[PDB]
Amino acid sequence: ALGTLEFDLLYDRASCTLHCSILRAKGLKPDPYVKLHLLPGACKANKLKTKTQRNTLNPVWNEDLTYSGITDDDITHKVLRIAVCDEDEFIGEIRVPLRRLKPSQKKHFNICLERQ
């Protein structure tokens, strides 16, 4: 379909931090970069992005992006939208409810991107 995205999420409860390791993508179907949007809210604070990789459908970022101020209740209610885009157009996205995470347990994802 649209390709796959590999990333890790780790919630560190004591420091109230969500660590998002954006690793790589494979088989993108269109200069890819990834943007993270922690929902809900259009707030600047909710939005992080990787560097842009050039001339590739198999970019490797190996980039750690982090949110601070993350509480238990944020973990149960918030959603992390992860979108890969083509720098200068939408390539694909996934939507991850944070309540799938456990404190201090890194979860590894390899997920198929979607149009949704």
- Is residue 72 annotated as involved in ligand binding? no
- Is residue 31 annotated as involved in ligand binding? yes
- Is residue 73 annotated as involved in ligand binding? no
User: C-alpha distances in angstroms, 60 versus 19, 25, 66?
Assistant: 18, 7, 18
Name the token pair of 74. Answer: 């944020």
Name the token pair of 45. Answer: 């604070």
Method: X-ray
| Rounded distance between C-alpha atoms, residue 51 and residue 101, angstroms | 25
Domains and CATH numbers, the chain: 1-116 (2.60.40.150)
